[PDB]
Amino acid sequence: MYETIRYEVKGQVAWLTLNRPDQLNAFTEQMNAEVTKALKQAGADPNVRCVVITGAGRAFCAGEDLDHGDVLRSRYAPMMKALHHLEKPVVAAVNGAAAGAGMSLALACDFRLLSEKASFAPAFIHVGLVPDAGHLYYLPRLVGRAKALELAVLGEKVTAEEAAALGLATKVIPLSDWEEEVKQFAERLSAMPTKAIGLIKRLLRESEETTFDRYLEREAECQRIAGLTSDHREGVKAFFEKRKPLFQGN
Amino acid sequence: MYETIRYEVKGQVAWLTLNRPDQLNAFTEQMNAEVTKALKQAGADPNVRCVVITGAGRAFCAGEDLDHGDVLRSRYAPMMKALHHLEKPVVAAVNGAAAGAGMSLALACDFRLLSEKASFAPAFIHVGLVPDAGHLYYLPRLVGRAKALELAVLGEKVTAEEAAALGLATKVIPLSDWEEEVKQFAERLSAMPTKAIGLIKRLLRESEETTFDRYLEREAECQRIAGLTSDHREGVKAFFEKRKPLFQGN
Amino acid sequence: MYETIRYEVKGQVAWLTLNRPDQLNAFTEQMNAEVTKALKQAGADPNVRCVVITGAGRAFCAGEDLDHGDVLRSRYAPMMKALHHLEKPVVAAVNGAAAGAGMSLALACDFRLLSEKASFAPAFIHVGLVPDAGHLYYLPRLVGRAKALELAVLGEKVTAEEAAALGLATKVIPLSDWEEEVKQFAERLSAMPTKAIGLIKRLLRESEETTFDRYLEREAECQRIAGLTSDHREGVKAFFEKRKPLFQGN
């Protein structure tokens, strides 16, 4: 099987659990490699309509287990590129501490559900390093330049509620409610028109990399595709029937 | 005349009213075409110093009246390009429901005045489609990536006050106050240095598409232009006279 | 010496004080030139680990002392490029009114500490001009498109607490506390791993100008550099010693 993570499809959600609980799920070469493979697996599997990444144990992910360039390009780049190109929704279920590259991973996901005991630690600066695995590409796109610099430079840990105030949490979930609310959010996404969700992620990528004029040409192509989909014709037949749509993801 | 919209200059404001009230001002081929023409008209008219877009009836615009690519490139692209290149200020006076491409249109305007009964519905996903007519180009530039994805993916309707909290409303206006506050806001803009306002819109476009170094060269050119303007010399003569400036828009 | 500014290194912080108090520290050709030189000086000095820019007297900077293009390209462009390429942290200690290009200068800094009596005045529009010296490049990257347009177009002055609400202040400092809190914030930064801070500023620049794929290659190169640094090996030796790290900035 996988050795540093757990990959389990339950219903139509792939549960990707980071699994080195004694080391707070800190990344190693094979965790990096397994996460990459699992993300590509989830992307290729027609039965997978949502992905959840969460940590085993008390923490979400403490980042690198403690040439830095080579570490990044050989281990982290393939993983972050797989995540970045994955066209299924991905929820970071941040069950506890996310620090370093663990914070990076959470920022790269589409939704972040923070348990009431979770926290984000942009800890790189305290060992004289820079935020990495994509951190400074994502962070200002979520919080603007000033807050991203403050986080990266001052390195101060943020609580779940402080993360929510910053715009870094989709929601904060009480501990007793954790397992059920996470599952319901993931199942709720896994029931939506998955192909339209992938195309909107594609378009959000286009939005950050292209000009307005070219963007509209990309958009029109995405909509020709969504429009041909079975889910679209279910959505229209259910609207024009005062009925609840049943979507399949194609 | 125009048949699906009303275009009326009152004072120095062009009132562009979307006018298919029985279908909640939903777009058709000729509404798309008329809005395009009217925006270009307003842009070319030296007497027009502000534009207001609003909906007749209860709603602002319910979006497409219900090949998707061809629909977008042939109808919506010319309209959104006309809006995007228009260098006069444009206020979306969102009098009621804005859904689908109606929400898109509102996001593309410079200011959004929401009546207390208005709402934004990113409804595309519920029929298995993607937000379009520029939606995902504008939205993350207003609310950041995470909130834009949440809106696009979960598709949940937002109230006027929730839109204001998200940074999607310039202000929320009580119903009894609606007609007067909208007119005063538009007249207030129509009295400002319209040529400087067009150049700042030009520069905001440059800001999103160019690098810092090139940006400064674009800025210097815009300021040479604003500096030659009659409005600039009125502004300086009124400052150095403890007086209220009277601007003409050139 | 310098004539329109004061440049003084105290400890490891360069205090760059704008110094035309009778004209509210408004820029002239030689203030522009001196600030440029001083920023490059601070950047080249291994003993300087933080920069503070503040105004002498009651105001921070009222902007241009009252061909606009030539003014910008010959005076302001070199100054803003020096600031933009400076890889040491720069705090704008906004002691009072920042208006016009004075507001521009504050937005270009990494942190903005506002005294309780400071204010930001995007005043350009009231003389028929556009916000300049980089204003519209920085501003939407801090507050999003809508608020940047509202500020630029309506030109309404904002209080310290309103700036904090907008995301334009790192913090608001009471008047009695001003001198000490500013010094402690600057000294606190001057003690951090300055080379990692410069590399994160480099990466924030890369983040706004490059694509995701290229960004990761830039990041890996920055981290190879931070990783070789003496500060990094101090940070690791102090973590693995339950000890407070002592950083030198190399």
mmCIF file with all atom_site columns, N, CA and C in Angstrom, chain A residues 66-69 72-73 81 84 125-134 136-138 140-141 144-146 149-150 153-154 156 209, chain C residues 110-112 141-142 170 188-189 192-193 196 199-200 203-205 207-208 211-213 215 217 219-220 223-224 226-227 232 235 240 247:
data_model
loop_
_atom_site.group_PDB
_atom_site.id
_atom_site.type_symbol
_atom_site.label_atom_id
_atom_site.label_alt_id
_atom_site.label_comp_id
_atom_site.label_asym_id
_atom_site.label_entity_id
_atom_site.label_seq_id
_atom_site.pdbx_PDB_ins_code
_atom_site.Cartn_x
_atom_site.Cartn_y
_atom_site.Cartn_z
_atom_site.occupancy
_atom_site.B_iso_or_equiv
_atom_site.pdbx_formal_charge
_atom_site.auth_seq_id
_atom_site.auth_comp_id
_atom_site.auth_asym_id
_atom_site.auth_atom_id
_atom_site.pdbx_PDB_model_num
ATOM 1   N N  . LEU A 1 66  ? 12.414 17.859 10.074  1.00 0.00 ? 66  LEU A N  1
ATOM 2   C CA . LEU A 1 66  ? 13.738 18.386 10.426  1.00 0.00 ? 66  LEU A CA 1
ATOM 3   C C  . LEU A 1 66  ? 14.503 17.539 11.457  1.00 0.00 ? 66  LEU A C  1
ATOM 4   N N  . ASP A 1 67  ? 21.049 20.487 -0.398  1.00 0.00 ? 67  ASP A N  1
ATOM 5   C CA . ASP A 1 67  ? 20.663 21.641 -1.218  1.00 0.00 ? 67  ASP A CA 1
ATOM 6   C C  . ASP A 1 67  ? 19.138 21.826 -1.114  1.00 0.00 ? 67  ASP A C  1
ATOM 7   N N  . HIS A 1 68  ? 18.735 22.924 -0.480  1.00 0.00 ? 68  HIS A N  1
ATOM 8   C CA . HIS A 1 68  ? 17.316 23.277 -0.313  1.00 0.00 ? 68  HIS A CA 1
ATOM 9   C C  . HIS A 1 68  ? 16.578 23.452 -1.635  1.00 0.00 ? 68  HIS A C  1
ATOM 10  N N  . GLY A 1 69  ? 17.288 23.943 -2.640  1.00 0.00 ? 69  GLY A N  1
ATOM 11  C CA . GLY A 1 69  ? 16.709 24.088 -3.967  1.00 0.00 ? 69  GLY A CA 1
ATOM 12  C C  . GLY A 1 69  ? 16.309 22.763 -4.573  1.00 0.00 ? 69  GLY A C  1
ATOM 13  N N  . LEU A 1 72  ? 13.298 21.185 -2.936  1.00 0.00 ? 72  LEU A N  1
ATOM 14  C CA . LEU A 1 72  ? 12.090 21.759 -3.540  1.00 0.00 ? 72  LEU A CA 1
ATOM 15  C C  . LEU A 1 72  ? 11.778 21.287 -4.964  1.00 0.00 ? 72  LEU A C  1
ATOM 16  N N  . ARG A 1 73  ? 12.747 21.349 -5.881  1.00 0.00 ? 73  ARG A N  1
ATOM 17  C CA . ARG A 1 73  ? 12.431 20.993 -7.268  1.00 0.00 ? 73  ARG A CA 1
ATOM 18  C C  . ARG A 1 73  ? 12.187 19.507 -7.455  1.00 0.00 ? 73  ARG A C  1
ATOM 19  N N  . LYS A 1 81  ? 2.544  20.795 -8.298  1.00 0.00 ? 81  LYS A N  1
ATOM 20  C CA . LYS A 1 81  ? 2.019  20.859 -9.674  1.00 0.00 ? 81  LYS A CA 1
ATOM 21  C C  . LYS A 1 81  ? 0.842  19.920 -9.852  1.00 0.00 ? 81  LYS A C  1
ATOM 22  N N  . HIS A 1 84  ? -2.010 21.602 -8.191  1.00 0.00 ? 84  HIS A N  1
ATOM 23  C CA . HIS A 1 84  ? -2.384 22.831 -8.893  1.00 0.00 ? 84  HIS A CA 1
ATOM 24  C C  . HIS A 1 84  ? -3.147 22.503 -10.174 1.00 0.00 ? 84  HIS A C  1
ATOM 25  N N  . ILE A 1 125 ? 10.634 31.672 8.554   1.00 0.00 ? 125 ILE A N  1
ATOM 26  C CA . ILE A 1 125 ? 11.513 32.790 8.930   1.00 0.00 ? 125 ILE A CA 1
ATOM 27  C C  . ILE A 1 125 ? 12.327 32.546 10.223  1.00 0.00 ? 125 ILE A C  1
ATOM 28  N N  . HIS A 1 126 ? 11.749 31.799 11.162  1.00 0.00 ? 126 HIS A N  1
ATOM 29  C CA . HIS A 1 126 ? 12.449 31.540 12.428  1.00 0.00 ? 126 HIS A CA 1
ATOM 30  C C  . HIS A 1 126 ? 13.650 30.599 12.298  1.00 0.00 ? 126 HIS A C  1
ATOM 31  N N  . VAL A 1 127 ? 13.754 29.884 11.184  1.00 0.00 ? 127 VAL A N  1
ATOM 32  C CA . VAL A 1 127 ? 14.993 29.158 10.852  1.00 0.00 ? 127 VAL A CA 1
ATOM 33  C C  . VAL A 1 127 ? 15.738 29.821 9.683   1.00 0.00 ? 127 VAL A C  1
ATOM 34  N N  . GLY A 1 128 ? 15.460 31.093 9.440   1.00 0.00 ? 128 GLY A N  1
ATOM 35  C CA . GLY A 1 128 ? 16.162 31.820 8.373   1.00 0.00 ? 128 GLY A CA 1
ATOM 36  C C  . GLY A 1 128 ? 15.869 31.412 6.946   1.00 0.00 ? 128 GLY A C  1
ATOM 37  N N  . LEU A 1 129 ? 14.724 30.755 6.737   1.00 0.00 ? 129 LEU A N  1
ATOM 38  C CA . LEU A 1 129 ? 14.304 30.330 5.414   1.00 0.00 ? 129 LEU A CA 1
ATOM 39  C C  . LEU A 1 129 ? 13.094 31.135 4.892   1.00 0.00 ? 129 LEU A C  1
ATOM 40  N N  . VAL A 1 130 ? 12.734 30.924 3.621   1.00 0.00 ? 130 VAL A N  1
ATOM 41  C CA . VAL A 1 130 ? 11.634 31.647 2.997   1.00 0.00 ? 130 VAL A CA 1
ATOM 42  C C  . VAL A 1 130 ? 10.421 30.700 2.929   1.00 0.00 ? 130 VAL A C  1
ATOM 43  N N  . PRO A 1 131 ? 9.186  31.253 2.971   1.00 0.00 ? 131 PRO A N  1
ATOM 44  C CA . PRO A 1 131 ? 8.054  30.367 2.737   1.00 0.00 ? 131 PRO A CA 1
ATOM 45  C C  . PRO A 1 131 ? 8.133  29.756 1.348   1.00 0.00 ? 131 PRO A C  1
ATOM 46  N N  . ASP A 1 132 ? 7.906  28.450 1.260   1.00 0.00 ? 132 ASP A N  1
ATOM 47  C CA . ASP A 1 132 ? 8.081  27.717 0.012   1.00 0.00 ? 132 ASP A CA 1
ATOM 48  C C  . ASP A 1 132 ? 6.961  26.699 -0.329  1.00 0.00 ? 132 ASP A C  1
ATOM 49  N N  . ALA A 1 133 ? 7.206  25.815 -1.300  1.00 0.00 ? 133 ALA A N  1
ATOM 50  C CA . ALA A 1 133 ? 6.148  24.952 -1.877  1.00 0.00 ? 133 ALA A CA 1
ATOM 51  C C  . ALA A 1 133 ? 4.947  25.810 -2.322  1.00 0.00 ? 133 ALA A C  1
ATOM 52  N N  . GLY A 1 134 ? 5.224  26.984 -2.887  1.00 0.00 ? 134 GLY A N  1
ATOM 53  C CA . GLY A 1 134 ? 4.152  27.777 -3.499  1.00 0.00 ? 134 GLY A CA 1
ATOM 54  C C  . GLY A 1 134 ? 3.538  28.833 -2.600  1.00 0.00 ? 134 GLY A C  1
ATOM 55  N N  . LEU A 1 136 ? 4.157  31.827 -1.239  1.00 0.00 ? 136 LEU A N  1
ATOM 56  C CA . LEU A 1 136 ? 4.050  33.218 -1.616  1.00 0.00 ? 136 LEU A CA 1
ATOM 57  C C  . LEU A 1 136 ? 3.392  33.466 -2.974  1.00 0.00 ? 136 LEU A C  1
ATOM 58  N N  . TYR A 1 137 ? 3.029  32.397 -3.668  1.00 0.00 ? 137 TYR A N  1
ATOM 59  C CA . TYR A 1 137 ? 2.202  32.536 -4.854  1.00 0.00 ? 137 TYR A CA 1
ATOM 60  C C  . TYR A 1 137 ? 0.753  32.551 -4.384  1.00 0.00 ? 137 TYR A C  1
ATOM 61  N N  . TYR A 1 138 ? 0.404  31.624 -3.477  1.00 0.00 ? 138 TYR A N  1
ATOM 62  C CA . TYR A 1 138 ? -0.976 31.553 -2.995  1.00 0.00 ? 138 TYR A CA 1
ATOM 63  C C  . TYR A 1 138 ? -1.387 32.651 -2.044  1.00 0.00 ? 138 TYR A C  1
ATOM 64  N N  . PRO A 1 140 ? -0.539 35.906 -1.158  1.00 0.00 ? 140 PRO A N  1
ATOM 65  C CA . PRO A 1 140 ? -1.065 37.241 -1.480  1.00 0.00 ? 140 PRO A CA 1
ATOM 66  C C  . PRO A 1 140 ? -2.353 37.186 -2.304  1.00 0.00 ? 140 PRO A C  1
ATOM 67  N N  . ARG A 1 141 ? -2.576 36.094 -3.050  1.00 0.00 ? 141 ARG A N  1
ATOM 68  C CA . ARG A 1 141 ? -3.861 35.926 -3.770  1.00 0.00 ? 141 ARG A CA 1
ATOM 69  C C  . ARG A 1 141 ? -5.037 35.654 -2.835  1.00 0.00 ? 141 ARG A C  1
ATOM 70  N N  . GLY A 1 144 ? -3.809 39.489 0.148   1.00 0.00 ? 144 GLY A N  1
ATOM 71  C CA . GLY A 1 144 ? -3.219 40.764 -0.339  1.00 0.00 ? 144 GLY A CA 1
ATOM 72  C C  . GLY A 1 144 ? -1.756 40.875 0.046   1.00 0.00 ? 144 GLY A C  1
ATOM 73  N N  . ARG A 1 145 ? -1.035 41.852 -0.512  1.00 0.00 ? 145 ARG A N  1
ATOM 74  C CA . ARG A 1 145 ? 0.431  41.850 -0.341  1.00 0.00 ? 145 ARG A CA 1
ATOM 75  C C  . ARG A 1 145 ? 0.854  42.088 1.084   1.00 0.00 ? 145 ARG A C  1
ATOM 76  N N  . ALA A 1 146 ? 0.183  43.033 1.745   1.00 0.00 ? 146 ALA A N  1
ATOM 77  C CA . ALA A 1 146 ? 0.651  43.506 3.068   1.00 0.00 ? 146 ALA A CA 1
ATOM 78  C C  . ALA A 1 146 ? 0.548  42.354 4.080   1.00 0.00 ? 146 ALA A C  1
ATOM 79  N N  . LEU A 1 149 ? 3.115  39.576 3.431   1.00 0.00 ? 149 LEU A N  1
ATOM 80  C CA . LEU A 1 149 ? 4.463  39.965 3.890   1.00 0.00 ? 149 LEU A CA 1
ATOM 81  C C  . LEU A 1 149 ? 4.561  39.887 5.441   1.00 0.00 ? 149 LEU A C  1
ATOM 82  N N  . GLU A 1 150 ? 3.534  40.339 6.130   1.00 0.00 ? 150 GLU A N  1
ATOM 83  C CA . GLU A 1 150 ? 3.500  40.322 7.576   1.00 0.00 ? 150 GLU A CA 1
ATOM 84  C C  . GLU A 1 150 ? 3.585  38.892 8.120   1.00 0.00 ? 150 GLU A C  1
ATOM 85  N N  . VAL A 1 153 ? 7.098  37.491 7.157   1.00 0.00 ? 153 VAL A N  1
ATOM 86  C CA . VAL A 1 153 ? 8.262  38.175 7.719   1.00 0.00 ? 153 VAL A CA 1
ATOM 87  C C  . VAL A 1 153 ? 8.264  38.080 9.221   1.00 0.00 ? 153 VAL A C  1
ATOM 88  N N  . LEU A 1 154 ? 7.125  38.362 9.831   1.00 0.00 ? 154 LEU A N  1
ATOM 89  C CA . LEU A 1 154 ? 7.051  38.325 11.288  1.00 0.00 ? 154 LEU A CA 1
ATOM 90  C C  . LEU A 1 154 ? 6.883  36.901 11.786  1.00 0.00 ? 154 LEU A C  1
ATOM 91  N N  . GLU A 1 156 ? 4.374  35.080 12.756  1.00 0.00 ? 156 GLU A N  1
ATOM 92  C CA . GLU A 1 156 ? 3.585  34.845 13.953  1.00 0.00 ? 156 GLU A CA 1
ATOM 93  C C  . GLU A 1 156 ? 2.453  33.862 13.680  1.00 0.00 ? 156 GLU A C  1
ATOM 94  N N  . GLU A 1 209 ? -3.316 34.129 -14.915 1.00 0.00 ? 209 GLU A N  1
ATOM 95  C CA . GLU A 1 209 ? -2.172 34.091 -15.833 1.00 0.00 ? 209 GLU A CA 1
ATOM 96  C C  . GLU A 1 209 ? -2.344 34.784 -17.183 1.00 0.00 ? 209 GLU A C  1
ATOM 97  N N  . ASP C 1 110 ? 6.800  48.127 3.174   1.00 0.00 ? 110 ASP C N  1
ATOM 98  C CA . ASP C 1 110 ? 6.394  46.758 3.557   1.00 0.00 ? 110 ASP C CA 1
ATOM 99  C C  . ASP C 1 110 ? 5.409  46.741 4.731   1.00 0.00 ? 110 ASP C C  1
ATOM 100 N N  . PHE C 1 111 ? 5.598  47.663 5.669   1.00 0.00 ? 111 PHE C N  1
ATOM 101 C CA . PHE C 1 111 ? 4.724  47.815 6.832   1.00 0.00 ? 111 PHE C CA 1
ATOM 102 C C  . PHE C 1 111 ? 4.375  49.284 6.963   1.00 0.00 ? 111 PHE C C  1
ATOM 103 N N  . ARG C 1 112 ? 3.173  49.578 7.475   1.00 0.00 ? 112 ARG C N  1
ATOM 104 C CA . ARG C 1 112 ? 2.700  50.958 7.679   1.00 0.00 ? 112 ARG C CA 1
ATOM 105 C C  . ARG C 1 112 ? 2.207  51.065 9.131   1.00 0.00 ? 112 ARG C C  1
ATOM 106 N N  . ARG C 1 141 ? -3.455 45.782 -5.180  1.00 0.00 ? 141 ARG C N  1
ATOM 107 C CA . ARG C 1 141 ? -2.797 44.609 -4.557  1.00 0.00 ? 141 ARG C CA 1
ATOM 108 C C  . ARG C 1 141 ? -2.940 44.582 -3.038  1.00 0.00 ? 141 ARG C C  1
ATOM 109 N N  . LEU C 1 142 ? -3.398 45.686 -2.445  1.00 0.00 ? 142 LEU C N  1
ATOM 110 C CA . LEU C 1 142 ? -3.643 45.728 -1.010  1.00 0.00 ? 142 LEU C CA 1
ATOM 111 C C  . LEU C 1 142 ? -5.124 45.666 -0.680  1.00 0.00 ? 142 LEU C C  1
ATOM 112 N N  . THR C 1 170 ? -0.553 48.286 9.244   1.00 0.00 ? 170 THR C N  1
ATOM 113 C CA . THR C 1 170 ? -0.026 47.230 10.090  1.00 0.00 ? 170 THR C CA 1
ATOM 114 C C  . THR C 1 170 ? -0.500 47.388 11.546  1.00 0.00 ? 170 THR C C  1
ATOM 115 N N  . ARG C 1 188 ? 12.940 45.238 16.268  1.00 0.00 ? 188 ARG C N  1
ATOM 116 C CA . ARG C 1 188 ? 12.529 43.852 16.178  1.00 0.00 ? 188 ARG C CA 1
ATOM 117 C C  . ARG C 1 188 ? 12.792 43.273 14.778  1.00 0.00 ? 188 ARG C C  1
ATOM 118 N N  . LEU C 1 189 ? 12.479 44.025 13.712  1.00 0.00 ? 189 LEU C N  1
ATOM 119 C CA . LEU C 1 189 ? 12.794 43.569 12.337  1.00 0.00 ? 189 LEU C CA 1
ATOM 120 C C  . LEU C 1 189 ? 14.296 43.507 12.086  1.00 0.00 ? 189 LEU C C  1
ATOM 121 N N  . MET C 1 192 ? 15.906 40.222 12.845  1.00 0.00 ? 192 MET C N  1
ATOM 122 C CA . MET C 1 192 ? 15.459 39.011 12.160  1.00 0.00 ? 192 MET C CA 1
ATOM 123 C C  . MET C 1 192 ? 16.451 38.636 11.056  1.00 0.00 ? 192 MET C C  1
ATOM 124 N N  . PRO C 1 193 ? 16.290 37.446 10.436  1.00 0.00 ? 193 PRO C N  1
ATOM 125 C CA . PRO C 1 193 ? 17.194 37.008 9.343   1.00 0.00 ? 193 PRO C CA 1
ATOM 126 C C  . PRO C 1 193 ? 17.002 37.847 8.084   1.00 0.00 ? 193 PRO C C  1
ATOM 127 N N  . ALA C 1 196 ? 16.879 36.306 4.516   1.00 0.00 ? 196 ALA C N  1
ATOM 128 C CA . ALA C 1 196 ? 15.598 35.624 4.228   1.00 0.00 ? 196 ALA C CA 1
ATOM 129 C C  . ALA C 1 196 ? 14.512 36.639 3.950   1.00 0.00 ? 196 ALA C C  1
ATOM 130 N N  . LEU C 1 199 ? 14.935 37.925 0.363   1.00 0.00 ? 199 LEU C N  1
ATOM 131 C CA . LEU C 1 199 ? 14.508 36.876 -0.561  1.00 0.00 ? 199 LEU C CA 1
ATOM 132 C C  . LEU C 1 199 ? 12.976 36.716 -0.606  1.00 0.00 ? 199 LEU C C  1
ATOM 133 N N  . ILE C 1 200 ? 12.320 36.897 0.533   1.00 0.00 ? 200 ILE C N  1
ATOM 134 C CA . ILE C 1 200 ? 10.856 36.873 0.477   1.00 0.00 ? 200 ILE C CA 1
ATOM 135 C C  . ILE C 1 200 ? 10.298 38.092 -0.285  1.00 0.00 ? 200 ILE C C  1
ATOM 136 N N  . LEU C 1 203 ? 10.723 37.176 -3.835  1.00 0.00 ? 203 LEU C N  1
ATOM 137 C CA . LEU C 1 203 ? 9.704  36.237 -4.231  1.00 0.00 ? 203 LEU C CA 1
ATOM 138 C C  . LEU C 1 203 ? 8.324  36.862 -4.347  1.00 0.00 ? 203 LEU C C  1
ATOM 139 N N  . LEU C 1 204 ? 8.007  37.848 -3.507  1.00 0.00 ? 204 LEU C N  1
ATOM 140 C CA . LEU C 1 204 ? 6.722  38.561 -3.640  1.00 0.00 ? 204 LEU C CA 1
ATOM 141 C C  . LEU C 1 204 ? 6.641  39.329 -4.958  1.00 0.00 ? 204 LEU C C  1
ATOM 142 N N  . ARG C 1 205 ? 7.765  39.877 -5.399  1.00 0.00 ? 205 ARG C N  1
ATOM 143 C CA . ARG C 1 205 ? 7.909  40.475 -6.729  1.00 0.00 ? 205 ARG C CA 1
ATOM 144 C C  . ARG C 1 205 ? 7.711  39.418 -7.802  1.00 0.00 ? 205 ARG C C  1
ATOM 145 N N  . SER C 1 207 ? 6.129  36.556 -7.554  1.00 0.00 ? 207 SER C N  1
ATOM 146 C CA . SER C 1 207 ? 4.711  36.156 -7.422  1.00 0.00 ? 207 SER C CA 1
ATOM 147 C C  . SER C 1 207 ? 3.761  37.042 -8.242  1.00 0.00 ? 207 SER C C  1
ATOM 148 N N  . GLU C 1 208 ? 3.997  38.359 -8.258  1.00 0.00 ? 208 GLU C N  1
ATOM 149 C CA . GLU C 1 208 ? 3.122  39.289 -8.985  1.00 0.00 ? 208 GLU C CA 1
ATOM 150 C C  . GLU C 1 208 ? 3.440  39.401 -10.481 1.00 0.00 ? 208 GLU C C  1
ATOM 151 N N  . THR C 1 211 ? 4.344  33.217 -13.905 1.00 0.00 ? 211 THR C N  1
ATOM 152 C CA . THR C 1 211 ? 3.353  32.145 -13.828 1.00 0.00 ? 211 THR C CA 1
ATOM 153 C C  . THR C 1 211 ? 3.687  31.149 -12.706 1.00 0.00 ? 211 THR C C  1
ATOM 154 N N  . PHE C 1 212 ? 2.714  30.343 -12.291 1.00 0.00 ? 212 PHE C N  1
ATOM 155 C CA . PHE C 1 212 ? 2.947  29.360 -11.224 1.00 0.00 ? 212 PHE C CA 1
ATOM 156 C C  . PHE C 1 212 ? 4.184  28.469 -11.445 1.00 0.00 ? 212 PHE C C  1
ATOM 157 N N  . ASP C 1 213 ? 4.279  27.866 -12.637 1.00 0.00 ? 213 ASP C N  1
ATOM 158 C CA . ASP C 1 213 ? 5.387  26.983 -12.964 1.00 0.00 ? 213 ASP C CA 1
ATOM 159 C C  . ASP C 1 213 ? 6.744  27.672 -12.826 1.00 0.00 ? 213 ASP C C  1
ATOM 160 N N  . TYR C 1 215 ? 7.308  30.445 -11.163 1.00 0.00 ? 215 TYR C N  1
ATOM 161 C CA . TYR C 1 215 ? 7.412  30.839 -9.755  1.00 0.00 ? 215 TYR C CA 1
ATOM 162 C C  . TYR C 1 215 ? 8.132  29.774 -8.893  1.00 0.00 ? 215 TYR C C  1
ATOM 163 N N  . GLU C 1 217 ? 10.295 27.581 -9.765  1.00 0.00 ? 217 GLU C N  1
ATOM 164 C CA . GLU C 1 217 ? 11.736 27.541 -10.072 1.00 0.00 ? 217 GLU C CA 1
ATOM 165 C C  . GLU C 1 217 ? 12.461 28.709 -9.377  1.00 0.00 ? 217 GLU C C  1
ATOM 166 N N  . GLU C 1 219 ? 11.416 30.174 -6.598  1.00 0.00 ? 219 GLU C N  1
ATOM 167 C CA . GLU C 1 219 ? 11.377 29.862 -5.178  1.00 0.00 ? 219 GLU C CA 1
ATOM 168 C C  . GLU C 1 219 ? 12.510 28.931 -4.742  1.00 0.00 ? 219 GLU C C  1
ATOM 169 N N  . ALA C 1 220 ? 12.731 27.879 -5.533  1.00 0.00 ? 220 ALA C N  1
ATOM 170 C CA . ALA C 1 220 ? 13.755 26.872 -5.228  1.00 0.00 ? 220 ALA C CA 1
ATOM 171 C C  . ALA C 1 220 ? 15.135 27.509 -5.211  1.00 0.00 ? 220 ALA C C  1
ATOM 172 N N  . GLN C 1 223 ? 15.587 29.565 -1.949  1.00 0.00 ? 223 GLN C N  1
ATOM 173 C CA . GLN C 1 223 ? 15.715 28.720 -0.782  1.00 0.00 ? 223 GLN C CA 1
ATOM 174 C C  . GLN C 1 223 ? 17.092 28.077 -0.737  1.00 0.00 ? 223 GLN C C  1
ATOM 175 N N  . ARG C 1 224 ? 17.695 27.771 -1.905  1.00 0.00 ? 224 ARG C N  1
ATOM 176 C CA . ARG C 1 224 ? 19.102 27.294 -1.947  1.00 0.00 ? 224 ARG C CA 1
ATOM 177 C C  . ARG C 1 224 ? 19.972 28.352 -1.312  1.00 0.00 ? 224 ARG C C  1
ATOM 178 N N  . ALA C 1 226 ? 18.902 30.921 0.855   1.00 0.00 ? 226 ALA C N  1
ATOM 179 C CA . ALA C 1 226 ? 18.650 31.126 2.280   1.00 0.00 ? 226 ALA C CA 1
ATOM 180 C C  . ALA C 1 226 ? 19.302 29.997 3.075   1.00 0.00 ? 226 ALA C C  1
ATOM 181 N N  . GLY C 1 227 ? 19.332 28.813 2.474   1.00 0.00 ? 227 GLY C N  1
ATOM 182 C CA . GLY C 1 227 ? 19.802 27.619 3.128   1.00 0.00 ? 227 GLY C CA 1
ATOM 183 C C  . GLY C 1 227 ? 21.299 27.609 3.400   1.00 0.00 ? 227 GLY C C  1
ATOM 184 N N  . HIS C 1 232 ? 20.472 30.710 8.804   1.00 0.00 ? 232 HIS C N  1
ATOM 185 C CA . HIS C 1 232 ? 19.781 29.434 8.746   1.00 0.00 ? 232 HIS C CA 1
ATOM 186 C C  . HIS C 1 232 ? 20.396 28.422 9.728   1.00 0.00 ? 232 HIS C C  1
ATOM 187 N N  . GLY C 1 235 ? 19.513 29.319 13.213  1.00 0.00 ? 235 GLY C N  1
ATOM 188 C CA . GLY C 1 235 ? 18.103 28.999 13.466  1.00 0.00 ? 235 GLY C CA 1
ATOM 189 C C  . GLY C 1 235 ? 17.870 27.541 13.785  1.00 0.00 ? 235 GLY C C  1
ATOM 190 N N  . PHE C 1 240 ? 16.940 23.168 17.723  1.00 0.00 ? 240 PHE C N  1
ATOM 191 C CA . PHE C 1 240 ? 17.452 21.937 18.311  1.00 0.00 ? 240 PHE C CA 1
ATOM 192 C C  . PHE C 1 240 ? 18.290 22.185 19.561  1.00 0.00 ? 240 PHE C C  1
ATOM 193 N N  . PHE C 1 247 ? 20.453 36.191 15.293  1.00 0.00 ? 247 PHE C N  1
ATOM 194 C CA . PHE C 1 247 ? 20.636 36.349 13.843  1.00 0.00 ? 247 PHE C CA 1
ATOM 195 C C  . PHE C 1 247 ? 21.500 37.560 13.494  1.00 0.00 ? 247 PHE C C  1
#
